[PDB]
Design a protein around this ligand. Structure first.
Ligand code: SF4
Lengths: 117, 118
């Protein structure tokens, strides 16, 4: 109703942000959504991962076109537990392991720090 | 859950024919299907009631959409209750089909003479 036709996760994000804003307004003090500042790595290149082990992605089970063009049965099927674990074990763990207990992140969020300059 | 006997009720002559007395044997019959079947890879295989009813509704809707109204026939047995027959008539109205009949039904003559086939 506000952004126009978009994908569903955008609508869900809008709903969550609006819920937080509405809770703030009901508490009495209306506060606009503030986006935190994150430290991110933008200099990364594939040559930084030349040593990582190459693992194939989980296969996608898709129904045959001839059999699926006649019914409304679901096309793709859910992965198995073994395949799910093997797929989730392919993660590179890019985020910091100390994110929830880092104090530098908290302090750079508490102050309007401009790192680019 | 098994039927063991059938007895007549002493209403008038207290009588039952061969069918009512002995053909109740089909209730215990082990050849009765208890789960729906849908066509996978060209063969009927068991499924859940929700998926089977969804498939039924989508097939009927596809037939109605492609071939227009009055393209679906409902051939209902005459052993169903009054409520089931009325519900089938309602569903036929929902499918925009007036072909609501039975293969056991003979051409009526009494409603053109007296008014009601009864
Ligand atoms: S943390 Fe895992 S899922 Fe997220 S970008 Fe890195 S490899 Fe991909």
């Amino acid at each position: 109703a506000v952004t126009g036709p978009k994908i569903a996760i955008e609508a869900i994000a809008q709903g969550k942000n609006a819920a937080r804003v509405i809770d703030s307004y009901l508490r009495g003090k209306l506060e606009p959504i503030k986006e935190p500042y994150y430290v991110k790595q933008e200099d990364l290149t594939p040559e930084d991962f030349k040593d990582r082990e190459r693992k194939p992605r989980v296969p996608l089970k898709v129904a045959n076109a001839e059999e699926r063009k006649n019914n409304f049965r679901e096309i793709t099927s859910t992965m198995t537990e073994k395949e799910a674990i093997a797929e989730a074990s392919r993660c590179l763990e890019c985020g910091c392991m100390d994110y929830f207990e880092c104090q530098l992140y908290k302090y750079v969020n508490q102050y309007d720090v401009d790192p680019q300059r | 859950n098994l039927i063991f006997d059938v007895s007549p009720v002493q209403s008038n002559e207290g009588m039952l024919c061969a069918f009512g007395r002995f053909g109740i044997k089909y209730v215990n019959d082990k050849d009765r299907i208890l789960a729906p079947l849908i066509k996978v890879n060209g063969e009927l295989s068991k499924t859940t009631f929700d998926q089977a009813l969804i498939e039924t509704a989508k097939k009927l809707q596809a037939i109605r959409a492609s071939y227009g109204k009055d393209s679906i026939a409902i051939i209902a047995s005459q052993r169903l209750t009054n409520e089931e027959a009325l519900l089938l008539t309602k569903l036929a109205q929902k499918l925009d089909t007036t072909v609501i009949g039975s293969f056991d039904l003979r051409e009526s003559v009494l409603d053109r003479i007296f008014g009601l086939n009864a």
